[PDB]
Amino acid sequence: GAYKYLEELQRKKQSDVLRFLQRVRVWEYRQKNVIHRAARPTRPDKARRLGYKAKQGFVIYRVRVRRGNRKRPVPKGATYGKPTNQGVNELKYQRSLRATAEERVGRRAANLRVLNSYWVNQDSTYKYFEVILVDPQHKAIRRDARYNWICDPVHKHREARGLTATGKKSRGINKGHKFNNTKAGRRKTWKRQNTLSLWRYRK
Amino acid sequence: AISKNLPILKNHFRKHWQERVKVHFDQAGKKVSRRNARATRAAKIAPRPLDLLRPVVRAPTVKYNRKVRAGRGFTLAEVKAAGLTAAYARTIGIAVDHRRQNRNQEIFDANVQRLKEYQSKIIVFPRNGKAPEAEQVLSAAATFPIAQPATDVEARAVQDNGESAFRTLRLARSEKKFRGIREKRAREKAEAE
Amino acid sequence: TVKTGIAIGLNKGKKVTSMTPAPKISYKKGAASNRTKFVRSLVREIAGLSPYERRLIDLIRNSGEKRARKVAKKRLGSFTRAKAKVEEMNNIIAASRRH
Amino acid sequence: PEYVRVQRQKKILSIRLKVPPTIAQFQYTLDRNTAAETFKLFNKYRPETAAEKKERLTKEAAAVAEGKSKQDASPKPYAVKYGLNHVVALIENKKAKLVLIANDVDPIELVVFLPALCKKMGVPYAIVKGKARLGTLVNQKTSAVAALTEVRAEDEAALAKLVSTIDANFADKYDEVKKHWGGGILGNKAQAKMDKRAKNSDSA
RNA sequence: GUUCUUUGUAAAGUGCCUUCGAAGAGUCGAGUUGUUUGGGAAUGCAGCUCUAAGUGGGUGGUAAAUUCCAUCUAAAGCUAA
RNA sequence: UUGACCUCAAAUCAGGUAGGAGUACCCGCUGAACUUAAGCAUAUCAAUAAGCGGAGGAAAAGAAACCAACCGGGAUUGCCUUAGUAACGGCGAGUGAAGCGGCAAAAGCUCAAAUUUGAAAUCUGGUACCUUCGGUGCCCGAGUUGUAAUUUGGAGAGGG
Ligand SMILES: [K+]
Ligand SMILES: [Mg+2]
Ligand SMILES: [Mg+2]
Ligand SMILES: [Mg+2]
Ligand SMILES: [Mg+2]
Ligand SMILES: [Mg+2]
Ligand SMILES: [Mg+2]
Ligand SMILES: [Mg+2]
Ligand SMILES: [Mg+2]
Ligand SMILES: [Mg+2]
Ligand SMILES: [Mg+2]
Ligand SMILES: [Mg+2]
Ligand SMILES: [Mg+2]
Ligand SMILES: [Mg+2]
Ligand SMILES: [Mg+2]
Ligand SMILES: [Mg+2]
């Protein structure tokens, strides 16, 4: 409906009308700070789809992140090991830019819990994502049983532990033979398979 | 370090396995703890037998399809045939699973047969009634055993028509092996230029 | 479609009484959704074509289906996706001026 | 301050770049004199206020108990319908008899599609100046839409000439504004620079 | 356990006939690159580029073309032992 | 001859929350080398130690874009097996999981996308009162760029 016009239009991100807006918008975000409060979502369709509700306590942040690989921070490219570890310029930091931005806003609004995030614009040097936050101290969120699971401490800093949407996507956590290597957690999985399980009555 | 005639071993012990060795000294301690858990769960819950009624259902994987085993929960179709709605059965201790589908009548009729039997064996306590002592039973699965269906009768007379089972078996495999090959030649031989 | 009753052959396995149960509402993930078809048409009329989509339509009009589908395969992921793209471009070009 | 500097630079960039035809159909705003009349008519259809809702509920509740009222203790209301989801569904049901949308919505994706959709159902639409006045229409701060479906008998005259006036400006003009590109403004120093070039070179 | 509470034409459940049936994008997917995996014409993850559809999409452990079938339905979320 | 919008501010404004510690276990990022190969570079050690960020009494995963290919099972997790097997590997040294089967425990679910439009029906705050982990009244404010009821695919809704 009224949001599917927003949804279906957004599929045509390369369309003539949107190319005007993104180019205008990427200029608008560039001039402002790296992290700044967003008065209202730029994509109210996407936010509601993703769980944002026009309620007091929901916080929206815009963040810009540098693009590209993670240059190995060894001094002057000296790695001091076998030649397979000499590679420095071509390391990929196997965790998404969406996660990297999501950490930074999570640190910025340290009192607060990251729900999810979605990108809004990009260029060659930067990526821009707009981040959804939920306020667990506002009584509107402690009440409202649809959302009071936020108020529990067990999900605090959901963003840093890889419990967010892109975190699960990056951790490789999904069902199938295609994910058997990392199903219950790669490190958790590794420990279980490399454990020598001994019973008192030896088999 | 290779000695005389001895078999090749592949014992994988070149990582720091010393750090991850779980020796189950707690086997005895865990079993009493579990028996303690079952007892307190039984006393805590109402006089219900610690488990849900599980369907009679065929195993996959022809290595094991010769057998029957308990399923996770009943299909919606089976529960409807019993005369309940799906939500209500879970309240009574009947496990319902939406992922399974019925493509086998004998399995379908077997379940509804045990559904009616279970219904015969229930007293549902009214929400604001008397609730007399019901001599709580511990295991519904023990009360409703799984029976392996009998496939045939003990004795019969042979009806050998000279079928020469290999000629049945070998040609069935030969017919499948060249199956698509035969229609291919149907494409050329019915081409009629 | 009845099983042959034996462990070998095309339809191997035992003969059992089928029901072919009532279908799930899933398997309709590619549903029609007349209103959604309407929305797709509407957004098609507001928003024009991608530059690359326009290049493919020009390939349709001048150079031909084989090169056009080849370029669609090169741009998009799969040859099936390329076939779908060229087919919808044929529909739109037909609905266009050369009615 | 930078926020002043940024916002000024927001509009100047928005015009110097070429604007696609689909947007900047909002650059044509409904003219002054008809604007007064349109809201002069619409102000007679202000929905229930905070106080007015209370008294009707009291006079209705204090009625159903003894008068056996079957929820017909109140007249059929005639008020402006607001809400983007509310309005968009209304055109799709062809119930919107007149819809006018604010032209200053920050995310244009919320309102860019609506005038084009109104044309396809043949529903009169007006690109109107000012979301703030839309808010004061319906006792809100901002509404971004305003739709009238039902009118009193004696006020049917007002819309018909008004709809002729509005449709004469936006909906009748749809097909030509649909292929009319926007933007293309050079700066004042740039414009004087080009004219200086034209007065020297072009006109010599 | 039973005693003040009585909610309330307030809400819910099942049958038949019909019209529908809304379901998530710089994301799936593809190329290339690095790491990793038992995954080997490439298991996962990430970077850059291209980047969709709705009788579609993923998978069906050998790349691709052709024709089918089975199986579920991502790019949103909670949950005790 | 004015006040509403949008955005951005400041205040020792009313009220809040974050920092740090511990860290055995847990969730991620980063990440070697000794060693093995009787040398050694791919490989092994190891997706480990060291480093960084983040929780709880458990954490994580969790109700299929699953596994299968059989008459098909049906959230996740743990154990016995599968199995030192399929497969990877200067096919050398070595590495090496998953389906089924038995068992423990069992549990199922919810939002966006549906105009309530004969009635923002929704929520925070402040005040007064009372039977105060709150409730009632009143008033500001949030909110139509959408807060309640309804719906979540196993369906379900408009109708009769
Ligand atoms: K190193
Ligand atoms: Mg979905
Ligand atoms: Mg690494
Ligand atoms: Mg203060
Ligand atoms: Mg050596
Ligand atoms: Mg040596
Ligand atoms: Mg460490
Ligand atoms: Mg603690
Ligand atoms: Mg526990
Ligand atoms: Mg957990
Ligand atoms: Mg979870
Ligand atoms: Mg599901
Ligand atoms: Mg399972
Ligand atoms: Mg290894
Ligand atoms: Mg506010
Ligand atoms: Mg219902």
**DSSP-derived 3-state class of residue D204:** coil
C33 Cβ contacts chain E strand, under 7 Å: yes
> Which nucleotide does the CA of A69 lie closest to, via C1'?
E47
**DSSP-derived 3-state class of residue D127:** strand
Buried-exposed string D134-172: b where 16+ CB fall within 10 A, e elsewhere: bbebbeeebbbbbbbeebeeeeeebbeebeebbbebbbe
CB B73 within 8 A of CB B52: yes
For A:139-198, CB contacts with B below 8 A are 191, 194-198
This structure's resolution (Å) is 3.1
User: Closest chain D residue to C47 measured between Cα atoms?
Assistant: D22
Distance A141 CA to F78 C1' (A): 36
Q: For residue C72, what is the enclosing H or E element?
A: helix C65-75
Residue A35 CA from chain centroid, whole number: 15
Return phi, psi of residue A177, to 5°. Answer: -70, -25
Residues with CB under 5 A from ligand 1 (ion): A 80-81
Contacts of A46 in chain D (CB under 8 A): none
Cα gap B136→A168, rounded to integer Å: 45
CB-based contact C9 B102, cutoff 8 Å = no
Rounded to 10 deg, the angle between the C79-95 and C65-75 helix axes is: 120
Q: For residue D102, what is the enclosing H or E element?
A: strand D98-102
Question: Cα–Cα–Cα angle for D60, D61, D62, nearest 5°?
Answer: 90
Cα gap B129→B57, rounded to integer Å: 37
Which nucleotides in chain E have some atom under 7 angstroms from a protein Cβ?
1-2, 13-15, 20-30, 33-39, 43-61, 64-66, 71-73, 75-81
Distance C47 CA to E31 C1' (A): 28
Other Cβ atoms within 10 Å of B173 Cβ, number: 13
Method: cryo-EM
- Residues of A (130-169) placing their beta carbon closer than 7 angstroms to any atom of strand F are 137-140, 143-144, 146, 153-157, 160-163, 167-168
Cα gap B130→C24, rounded to integer Å: 43
**DSSP-derived 3-state class of residue D201:** helix
Cα end-to-end span (Å), chain A? 64
Q: For residue D147, what is the enclosing H or E element?
A: strand D145-148
Distance A41 CA to E46 C1' (A): 28
Cα gap A120→A101, rounded to integer Å: 13
- Residues of B (1-30) placing their beta carbon closer than 7 angstroms to any atom of strand F are 10-16
Distance D120 CA to F107 C1' (A): 50
Q: Which among C22, C6, C14, C8 is positioned nearest to B106, based on CA atoms?
A: C14
Q: Domain D1-187, what fold? A: 60s Ribosomal Protein L30; Chain: A; (3.30.1330)
Q: Which among B168, B103, B57, B159 is positioned nearest to C4, based on CA atoms?
A: B168
Of B108, B169, B172, nearest to C19 by CB-CB distance is B108
Return phi, psi of residue A72, to 5°. Answer: -60, 125
User: Closest chain A residue to B24 measured between Cα atoms?
Assistant: A199
CATH superfamily of A1-203: Ribosomal protein L15 (3.40.1120.10)
Other Cβ atoms within 10 Å of B149 Cβ, number: 10
Minimum distance, in Å, between the CA of residue B67 and any CA atom of chain C: 14
**Rg (alpha carbons) of chain D, rounded to whole number:** 22
DSSP per-residue codes, chain A: -HHHHHHHHHHTTTSHHHHHHHHHHHHHHHHS-SEEE-SS-S-HHHHHHHT--SSTTEEEEEEEEE-S-----SGGG---S-GGG---TT---SS-HHHHHHHHHHHHTTTSEEEEEEEEEE-SSEEEEEEEEE-SSSHHHHS-TTTGGGGSGGGTTTTTTT-SHHHHHHHT--SSGGGTTSSS-HHHHHHHHT-EEEESS--
DSSP per-residue codes, B18-69: GG-EEEETTHHHHHHHHHHHHHHHHHHS-S--SS-B--EEE-STTTSTTSEE
Cα gap A63→A52, rounded to integer Å: 18
Q: Are strands D125-128 and D98-102 parallel, antiparallel or unpaired?
A: parallel
Contacts of D92 in chain C (CB under 8 A): 35
CB D128 within 8 A of CB D144: no
Instruction: State the DSSP code for D12.
Output: H
Per-domain residue ranges of chain D = 1-187
- Give a three-class secondary structure readout of A58-90: EEEEEEEEECCCCCCCCHHHCCCCCHHHCCCCC
Which two tokens mark D78?
Answer: 């005639």
Return phi, psi of residue D98, to 5°. Answer: -160, 125
Distance C25 CA to E73 C1' (A): 11
- Residues of D (28-57) placing their beta carbon closer than 7 angstroms to any atom of strand F are 47-48, 50-51, 53-54, 56
A14 Cβ contacts chain E strand, under 7 Å: yes
**DSSP-derived 3-state class of residue D140:** coil
Q: In terms of CATH architecture, what is C16-99?
A: Orthogonal Bundle (1.10)
Cα end-to-end span (Å), chain B? 73
Residue A44 Cα distances to A41, B89, D106, angstroms: 5, 41, 12
Q: What is the largest CA-CA distance in chain A?
A: 74
B:C CB pairs within 8 Å:
36
Contacts of A203 in chain B (CB under 8 A): none
